[PDB]
């Protein structure tokens, strides 16, 4: 599989904090998805299930008509060595657990994924799920790894046009749904495709430390946003708290050519210090 990449023009703008704002222009410093970035286009037809590294956040999505895309698995070892944070989910049920497993060799789905048991430290099995002609259901999923929370902001939207598979051009925020306070070092990531042989296409982005300018509506929702590290016009609209700059020359930042090596020049004497004489002394003094 030679996985291609699509564009992510304006997608992945979640609510950083929990504060009602009305007609404001805030500038938050959190882990968002950069505008017009490269997002992998893993296609499931004949099917893919990689071990993509969960660095500091991923922007999961799905564009299909069925519900074969349901479930996630997190962890660093995934071989019953360390804990896990699977997000197994199905029709009107959520099987999110913390117990560690070895699955079999690779997840696929019935509880045919995992064949082991251990001490589970959470019981958030709570029922409420996280899930026309060509009204396809796009379901974004932002996962983070904050000190004590998982930050699982997600949402759902319908798309109309039956054009070739591609992220639509339209702003959409991601309201929080579940905030299970489980802390575990997560490095790996895996999606749980429903086998059901008796197809789809999930996108997997990556978050980076950025700086955005979120505009809130009178109703209290984020209608649009502009990055501050994409184009000079964006940095100009960021330094001045506005979305429509006027005619003129504006100061935005200062170029500073960054390094490219770290030279360490210490003396070339090589011996052993006589600390044994002073510290490990036979007779001390007064």
């Amino acid at each position: 599989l030679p996985p291609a990449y699509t564009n992510s023009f304006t997608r992945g703008v979640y609510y950083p904090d929990k504060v009602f704002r009305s007609s404001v222009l805030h500038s938050t410093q959190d882990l968002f998805l950069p505008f017009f970035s490269n997002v992998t286009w893993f296609h499931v037809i004949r099917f893919d299930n990689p071990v993509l590294p969960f660095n500091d956040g991923v922007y999961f999505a799905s564009i299909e008509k069925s519900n074969i895309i349901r479930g996630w698995i997190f962890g660093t070892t995934l071989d019953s060595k360390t804990q896990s944070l699977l997000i197994v989910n199905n029709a009107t049920n959520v099987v999110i657990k913390v117990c560690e497993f070895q699955f079999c060799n690779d997840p696929f789905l019935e509880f045919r994924v995992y064949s082991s048991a251990n001490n589970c430290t959470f019981e958030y099995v709570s029922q409420p799920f996280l899930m026309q002609g060509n009204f396809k259901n796009l379901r974004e999923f932002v996962f983070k790894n904050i000190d004590g929370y998982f930050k699982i902001y997600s949402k759902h939207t319908p798309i109309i046009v039956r054009e070739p598979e591609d992220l639509p051009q339209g702003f959409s925020a991601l309201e929080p749904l579940v905030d299970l306070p489980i802390g575990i070092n997560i490095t790996r990531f895996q999606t749980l495709l429903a086998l059901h042989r008796s197809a789809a296409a999930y996108y997997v982005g990556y978050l980076q430390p950025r700086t955005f300018l979120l505009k809130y509506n009178e109703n209290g929702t984020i209608t649009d946003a502009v990055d501050c590290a994409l184009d000079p016009l964006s940095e100009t609209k960021c330094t001045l708290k506005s979305f429509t700059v006027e005619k003129g020359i504006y100061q935005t930042s200062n170029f500073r050519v960054q390094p490219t090596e770290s030279i360490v020049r210490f003396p070339n004497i090589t011996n052993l210090c006589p600390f044994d004489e002073v510290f490990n002394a036979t007779r001390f003094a007064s």
């Binding site: 700059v245 005619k247 020359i249």
Partner: peptide
């Protein structure tokens, strides 16, 4: 340099203290 977000989105980047060799190209004072 921006004519404004009412006419177009084209912007010109003016560096200060560079001789176009340490960053249509134009070198002013």
């Amino acid at each position: 340099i921006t004519p404004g977000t009412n006419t177009s989105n084209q912007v010109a980047v003016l560096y200060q203290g560079v001789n176009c060799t340490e960053v249509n190209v134009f070198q002013t004072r």
